[PDB]
Amino acid sequence: DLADRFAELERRYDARLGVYVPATGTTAAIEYRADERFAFCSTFKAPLVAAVLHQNPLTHLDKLITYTSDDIRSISPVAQQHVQTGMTIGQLCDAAIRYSDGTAANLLLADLGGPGGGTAAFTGYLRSLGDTVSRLDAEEPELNRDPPGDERDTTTPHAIALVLQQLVLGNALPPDKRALLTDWMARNTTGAKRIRAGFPADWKVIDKTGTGDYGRANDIAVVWSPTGVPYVVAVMSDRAGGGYDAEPREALLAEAATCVAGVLA
Ligand SMILES: O=C(O)C[C@@H]1CC[C@H](NC(=O)Cc2cccs2)B(O)O1
């Protein structure tokens, strides 16, 4: 049973694995711990970009955001090199998705506005998509500090998969905006050893990764079959039994994805 093989992975990596592939017209759902909470980690940066796209005309992408060295409080591979010049909103969306840029994320949260530096607004966005489970309670990097059993800054594989489904493959965004989210995810630089590593070369993979404490490693993806048939793959993992500094394990996600591709191909 596919469920039994996921349990094999949990046992072998001493991990908790959560999987959701939504059903389609020609496939069953794949569900494993799909309604258990897992930390978002950097995965929220993809729907965050969708929020900003949703809320604004595309001309907003050209708005210049200036910030300081003092705004670099989290892993920010792009923003930390542009403190002198600032970055447009479009550049931040790019950085947030393609390089998990945590300062870009923080700036895009402030862009949504309102109490919580934008965290309330973000969660509200997910609520507008039908998601009553997910919650973002802090910015980077504090949103990573939540220990197991604290529901702050968590989602479920089921919730995040269905959010991604609506954003990339559904009608949550107008198709021009959707195209952007998709293109950015298609050119991600962080995802080569996760879901991408588990799918044959003839399948297309776009994704957004996340890594945190307690061995947290997530990847959410949209994949296209050699036929052009698209599916959403959400894979979430932690290794919390090893403590706050348990090693995150990309290969766990890669194996999970391989098992998923075996079912879908
Ligand atoms: O996209 C990825 O997979 C990596 C990305 C890096 C920035 C974010 N991590 C943090 O800010 C702190 C961290 C804890 C443990 C590792 S990095 B995010 O959650 O993950």
Q: Verify whether residue 10 is a known catalytic residue.
A: no
Tell me the helix, strand and coil percentages in the chain, rounded to 5: 45, 15, 40
Q: Where are the domains of the chain?
A: 2-264
The CA distance from 74 to 105, in Å, is 10
Tokens of 175: 């198709």
Q: What is the DSSP string of 15-51?
A: -EEEEEE--BTTB--EEESTTS-EE-GGGGHHHHHHH
Q: How do strand 16-21 and strand 230-238 relate by DSSP bridges?
A: antiparallel
| Ligand 1 mean position, distance from CA 177 (Å) | 26
Q: Under DSSP, is residue 78 helix (H, G, I), strand (E, B) or coil? A: coil
Check if the beta carbon of residue 20 is closer than 8 Å to that of residue 29.
yes
| Ligand 1 mean position, distance from CA 97 (Å) | 12
Number of helices followed by number of strands (H, E) in the chain: 9, 9
Name beta bridge partners: 217. Answer: 211, 237
Residue numbers belonging to the annotated binding site = 100, 209-211
Check if the beta carbon of residue 219 is closer than 8 Å to that of residue 209.
yes
Which amino acid, residue 134?
Answer: S
User: Which atom of ligand 1 is closest in space to residue 208's alpha carbon?
Assistant: 1
- The residues near 206 (Cβ < 8 Å, ≥ 6 apart) are 168, 182, 185, 186, 188, 221, 222, 223
Check if the beta carbon of residue 48 is closer than 8 Å to that of residue 66.
no
- The residues near 217 (Cβ < 8 Å, ≥ 6 apart) are 41, 194, 209, 210, 211, 237, 238, 248, 249, 250, 252, 253
The CA distance from 119 to 128, in Å, is 14
Q: What kind and span of H or E run contains 263? A: helix 250-264
User: Which atom of ligand 1 is closest in space to residue 218's alpha carbon?
Assistant: 3
CA torsion 222-39-135-22 (nearest 10°) is 30
The CA distance from 142 to 153, in Å, is 10
User: Which atom of ligand 1 is closest in space to residue 41's alpha carbon?
Assistant: 19
72 CB-contact burial (10 Å; exposed 0-12 / middle 13-18 / buried 19+): middle
Which CATH architecture group holds 2-264?
3-Layer(aba) Sandwich (3.40)
Tokens of 36: 């258990």
Ligand 1: residues with CB < 6 A are: 41-42, 74-75, 100, 102, 140-141, 144, 190, 209-213
69 CB-contact burial (10 Å; exposed 0-12 / middle 13-18 / buried 19+): exposed
The angle, 0 to 180 degrees and rounded to 10, between the axes of the packed helices 45-55 and 175-186 is 150
Of the residues 31, 42, 134, 250, which is catalytic?
42
Residue with tokens 């968590």: 154
List the Cα angle 44/50/53 in 5-degree steps. Answer: 145
The CA distance from 28 to 9, in Å, is 21
Residue with tokens 């796209």: 53
List the Cα angle 51/54/56 in 5-degree steps. Answer: 110
Residue with tokens 């050119």: 187
The CA distance from 152 to 167, in Å, is 23
Of the residues 10, 31, 139, 140, which is catalytic?
140
- Given ligand 1 and candidates 72, 75, 155, which is best to mutate, with the most ligand atoms within 8 Å of its CB? 75
Q: From the CB of residue 99, how many other CB atoms can be counted at a distance below 10 Å?
A: 19
Cβ-count burial 178-212 (b if 16+ within 10 Å, e if not): bebbbebbeebebbebbbbbbbeeebbbbbbbbbb
User: Which atom of ligand 1 is closest in space to residue 216's alpha carbon?
Assistant: 15
- Given ligand 1 and candidates 40, 78, 211, 237, which is best to mutate, with the most ligand atoms within 8 Å of its CB? 211
Name beta bridge partners: 20. Answer: 31, 234
The CA distance from 97 to 114, in Å, is 23
Q: Verify whether residue 250 is a known catalytic residue.
A: no
Distance of CA 200 to the CA centre of its chain: 21
